[PDB]
Design a protein around this nucleic acid. Structure first.
Lengths: 152, 92, 120, 51, 128
RNA sequence: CGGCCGCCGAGACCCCGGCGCACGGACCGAUUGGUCCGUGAUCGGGUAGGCGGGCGUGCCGGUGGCGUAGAAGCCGGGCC
RNA sequence: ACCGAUAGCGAACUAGUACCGUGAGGGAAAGCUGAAAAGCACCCCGGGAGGGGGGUGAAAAGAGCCUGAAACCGGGCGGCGAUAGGAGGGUGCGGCCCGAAAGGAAUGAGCCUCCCCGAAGGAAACCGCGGCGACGCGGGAGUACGAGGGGAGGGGACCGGGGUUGCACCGUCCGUCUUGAAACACGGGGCAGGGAGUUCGCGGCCGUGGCGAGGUUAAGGGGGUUAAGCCCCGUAGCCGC
RNA sequence: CUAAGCCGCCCGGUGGAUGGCUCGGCUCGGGGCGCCGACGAAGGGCGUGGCAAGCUGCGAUAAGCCCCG
């Protein structure tokens, strides 16, 4: 209600949606994790996030990867383990699963057909520096939106 | 090419006022005597009891707006219409 | 700057009528008077009854493309036509025995303009 | 803005004259379909009506 | 003449198809210009468009003007007249003028305008 | 090096169509003008600068109007 | 005939307030829900913040509240996309894609066939001749063709326009001083708002209008008016003769 | 059904331009009104509300007390 979804073809009979606003996590890492999770099944995405939190599986970086070391295995390449972002997105996914279940859809047939992360409001702060200079020290927040659909 | 948009009768004065448009693409503004003759011939007017109040050309348009009057009688003409218009139209 | 010409619609109509009458009768006096009236306002011709008396003969038709002023003394009987007449000039012309008429009246009386003298 | 007294008088006279022109009155926009004549002269009894 | 009218209409159509869009120099480079596409005369000392170098956008000139006979006419050949009510609609010439209803006119008045135009035989460019 | 032959090559030159400008002419406008015709091999680049016309914005005096059957504003398109 | 929240007083608001300097003193930013709070009862999830349903309202306009532009960021769609070089564009067209309305169009589109006229320009087959040769000359012939201007028949839904990209050729950004700017000369991260020939006095000149050997009032006075608008007077003075 | 990347449209976020509104400013011919204080002024400090911090108003009678209209 307060915030809208970028998905245009929402169908309440077959789809469910959830969101989280003003998350104190990195929007860039949220974007990377959402790009990895797009197009996946809900249970598979939950297992992916669990592995990332447990540090058993790196998330590749395709856009924001400066000064990032490579990882063992094929396709790496820069990668890391955004545990905080993974936890927040896991909470959002659990919420969307609850919404789908309350609607009446089978949780085992849900595919993530839409997932996105946006930059939200910036919480401003300052940090003192040398030669009497006050310099910005800001927190960037993230909005997460997810829409899942029941496949037949 | 004359198309009369409006003809109105004034009994309180005793005249017919005609508002018309002349459509002359590629031709100069028609002369007053030509417009009078064409109007009189077409509308069956009395040539000695009618004047052309004005003919106006507006920028790059080939349609000129004309206003003319036709009084009931020469008495009404001399009573209402003034001296300079009478000299210009040559009815005096 | 550009010359905007006379602002008076009556004067503009008179100039157009003068040109039309000159074309109709095949004479140059009316066109000459038209351009003389069309000359800039700050240079418009001003003529005095003294000059009219000096250079006019009895019973002559005079046309002034401007204003006629009444400084001096008039003795001849002259028919003077001008755009503007001062009150003193008109009184003096009438007393001398001429007529103070307009250019339209002069054209109506003498359409060919034969024998008319232009004075500035 | 200054205006000469004689020029103002001439303008007033011209406006008074133009008041009695049928073509100008109609072209301005006034409705004179039922007006008997122009200029419209009425008796002096009109000056005493206060209702 | 109808033949000359049609020929000049074709000439204007070809000329305005060939005419380019005159735009300010470096209009594509900045959003402040790309969002407001206009033409401004280049006046710099070293401006290539001002110097009229080949390989650069052209500049408007008096030669691009349409033929005088059909200048400003609707592509259909009629002359557009902006109409706001039935009184303005009824003053048109049905043979050679077309009516364009003002964008501000509401549906209630537009219905009456369209009906009057249909029963008078006047073409309407934007019938609702 | 001494000559020749044929081709290719500009916005130059020639031709058709259109625009404007300068000058002259006819006709027509209730404040600078408007339509049309005639001549231009002897009009059409342009910095400083001079001159003429036109487009756009706020408000006032008039005049003619639109709008909850949807004004201003904003976004993407069609036409001139 | 002043401004309309970067404007107007610095302050439309808890403004000479917050705040800076030991001190004289200096001094901001900040307006708007809706007609009515009717300001979301109840259910699922979450530690919470909140999320999803469901309600109120003509419209969420949801208090982070009228409209919500540009820059910027994320996703979806169309086009290109890992052997290709130029300031990111210009001319023409091709590939892919969009194409209801406002442009044309079933009173006929792209397209196919045929006929007539035609400016400047303008071939060749073939025949005869000149030249060592490239080749040229006379006929063909001012013919075929030619910008454009007209007509007839067939078919029956596109054409104009737009986004991206490809190919051929061309193209070393914008403003500025300078003889000379792509410059290894200066000002140039992006966007939105603001931003620079104004007023008075004197004088020269021009466009127009009034009166005219005269022209004109100043301060001020009377009438009338909601009013400072409007009407009449006012010769002191100034210029000219 | 090419990874990053580039341009265009749509949706969403961030931001607060534009538009509309105005109990506030600015400028004015005219009209009105122009000094307070040792009978203690102006300017300040501190208090004062049931829940009361700021502004405003009041002064231990403290967002107030009494009397005619």
């Amino acid at each position: 209600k307060r915030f809208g979804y970028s998905f245009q073809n929402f169908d309440p009979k077959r789809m469910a949606r959830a969101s989280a606003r003003d998350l104190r996590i990195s929007p860039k890492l949220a974007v990377e994790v959402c790009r990895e999770l797009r197009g996946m099944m809900l249970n598979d995405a939950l297992r992916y996030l669990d592995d990332v939190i447990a540090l058993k599986r790196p998330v590749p970086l395709k856009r924001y990867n400066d000064s990032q070391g490579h990882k063992p295995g094929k396709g790496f390449g820069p990668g890391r383990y955004p545990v905080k972002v993974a936890k927040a997105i896991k909470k959002v996914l659990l919420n969307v699963k609850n919404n789908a279940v309350q609607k009446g859809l089978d949780p085992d047939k849900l595919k993530i057909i839409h997932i996105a992360a946006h930059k939200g409001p910036v919480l401003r702060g300052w940090y003192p520096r040398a030669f009497g200079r006050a310099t910005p020290f800001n927190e960037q927040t993230t909005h997460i939106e997810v829409v899942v659909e029941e496949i037949r | 090419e004359i198309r009369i948009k409006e003809i109105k009768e004034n009994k309180l004065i005793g005249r017919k006022e005609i508002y018309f448009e002349i459509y002359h693409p590629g031709e100069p503004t028609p002369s007053r005597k030509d417009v009078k003759g064409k109007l009189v011939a077409m509308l069956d007017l009395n040539p000695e009891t009618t004047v052309i109040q004005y003919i106006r050309s507006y920028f790059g348009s080939y349609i000129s707006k004309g206003y003319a009057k036709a009084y009931d009688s020469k008495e009404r003409m001399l009573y209402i219409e003034p001296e300079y218009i009478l000299i210009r139209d040559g009815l005096i | 700057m550009k010359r905007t010409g006379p602002t008076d619609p009556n004067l503009r109509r008179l100039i157009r009528y003068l040109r039309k009458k000159s074309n109709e009768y095949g004479v140059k006096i009316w066109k000459d008077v038209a351009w003389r009236l069309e000359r800039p306002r700050r240079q418009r011709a001003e003529v005095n009854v003294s000059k009219i008396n000096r250079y006019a003969n009895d019973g002559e038709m005079i046309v002034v493309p401007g204003s006629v002023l009444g400084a001096g003394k008039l003795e001849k009987k002259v028919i003077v036509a001008a755009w503007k007449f001062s009150e003193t000039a008109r009184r003096k012309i009438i007393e001398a025995g001429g007529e103070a008429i307009t250019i339209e009246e002069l054209i109506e009386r003498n359409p060919t303009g034969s024998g008319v003298r232009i004075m500035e | 803005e200054d205006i000469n007294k004689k020029e103002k008088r001439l303008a007033l006279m011209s406006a008074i004259a133009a008041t009695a022109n049928y073509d100008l009155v109609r072209a301005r926009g006034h409705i004179i379909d039922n007006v008997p004549q122009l200029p419209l002269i009425v008796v002096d009894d009109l000056q005493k009506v206060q209702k | 003449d109808e033949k000359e009218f049609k020929r000049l209409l074709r000439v204007r159509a070809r000329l305005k198809r060939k005419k380019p869009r005159f735009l300010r120099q470096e209009w594509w480079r900045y959003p402040k210009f790309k969002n407001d596409p206009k033409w401004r005369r280049p006046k710099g000392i070293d401006s290539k468009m001002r110097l009229k170098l080949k390989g650069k956008p052209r500049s408007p000139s008096i030669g691009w003007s349409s033929p005088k006979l059909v200048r400003g006419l609707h592509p259909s050949g009629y002359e557009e007249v902006l109409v706001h009510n039935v009184k303005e609609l009824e003053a048109l010439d049905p043979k050679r003028q077309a009516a364009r209803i003002a964008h501000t006119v509401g549906k209630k008045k537009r219905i009456e305008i369209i009906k009057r135009a249909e029963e008078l035989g006047i073409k309407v460019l934007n019938p609702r």
